[PDB]
Structure 1
Amino acid sequence: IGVPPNSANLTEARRRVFDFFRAACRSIPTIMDIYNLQDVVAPSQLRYAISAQIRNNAHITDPKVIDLLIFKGMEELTDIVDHAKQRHHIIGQYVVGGKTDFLKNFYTSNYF
């Protein structure tokens, strides 16, 4: 319940990561119901987005940074579930549901 002490090493931090990932995935049906996503996106895409977020930070080696990331992820999950702010194609911070990029940006504006 209470905020745990910082992970002593990468093994226990990885264990906390796995626990957070399980808790996030198990809450997917509740999120699908709350945001009415049955005809918008598959549950596996939500799982895939969560896992991709975990993977993009796979280079972190400091257990304290991992603990902080897990705490922030838990808070964001709690706000998504308990205090949902429905938009359409967007849940929280994730979008749900022949020329190079330079030319497009140049046509857009002078600030890239």
Structure 2
Amino acid sequence: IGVPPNSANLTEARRRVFDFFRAACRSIPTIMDIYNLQDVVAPSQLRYAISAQIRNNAHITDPKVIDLLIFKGMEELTDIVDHAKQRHHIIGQYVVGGKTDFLKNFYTSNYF
């Protein structure tokens, strides 16, 4: 329902992170039916995708920033649950994925 009050410590932020992760995990079966993802992706590759996003945003130590990140993730999850976003959008974002980098960039363009 209502937006939760702002957290006061990192423990509450971690608890909200875990709650949101569990909510996203329970939301996995619904997406597999709303979008024809049955013969597309394993039911654990998506789980790993959310885990990887949480882990690469895991260097934050500000509880307010963590709460805002959780809120944005929950908004994205609610949007994906509804038919608002197109099918290829989630498949375009939620899929897990030789001389020198400098020389290839040099061959490409002057603006690195």
Alpha-carbon distance change, 12 to 82 in structure 1, aligned in 2, over 3 angstroms: same
Instruction: Provide, for residues 45-74 of structure 1, a one-character-per-residue CA deviation record: whole Å limited to 9, x for no partner.
Output: 100000111111111111000000000000
Q: Distance in 1 between matches of 2:111 and 2:94?
A: 25
Q: Aligned residue for 1:21?
A: 21
Partners of 2:33 and 2:17 lie apart in 1 by 25
The alignment's TM-score, normalised by the length of structure 1, stands at 0.85
Moved more, 19-28 or 82-91: 82-91
Task: Tell me, yes or no, if the aligned pair for 1:17 and 1:70 is still in contact at 8 Å.
Answer: yes
User: Deviation of residue 92 (structure 1)?
Assistant: 6.9
Indicate the RMSD between aligned Cα atoms, in angstroms. Answer: 2.2
Q: Give the structure-2-normalised TM-score.
A: 0.85
Percent identity reads: 100
Instruction: Extract unaligned runs of 5+ from structure 1.
Output: none
Which of structures 1 and 2 has the larger relative contact order (alpha carbons within 8 angstroms, sep 6+)?
A: 2
Structure 2's unaligned 5+ residue stretches are none
Cα separation, 1, equivalents of 2:81 and 2:110: 40
Q: Which stretch has the larger CA shift, 72-81 or 90-99?
A: 90-99
Q: Find the counterpart in structure 2 of residue 104 from structure 1.
A: 104
The number of aligned residues is 112
Structure 1 window deviating more from structure 2 (40-49 vs 94-103): it is 94-103
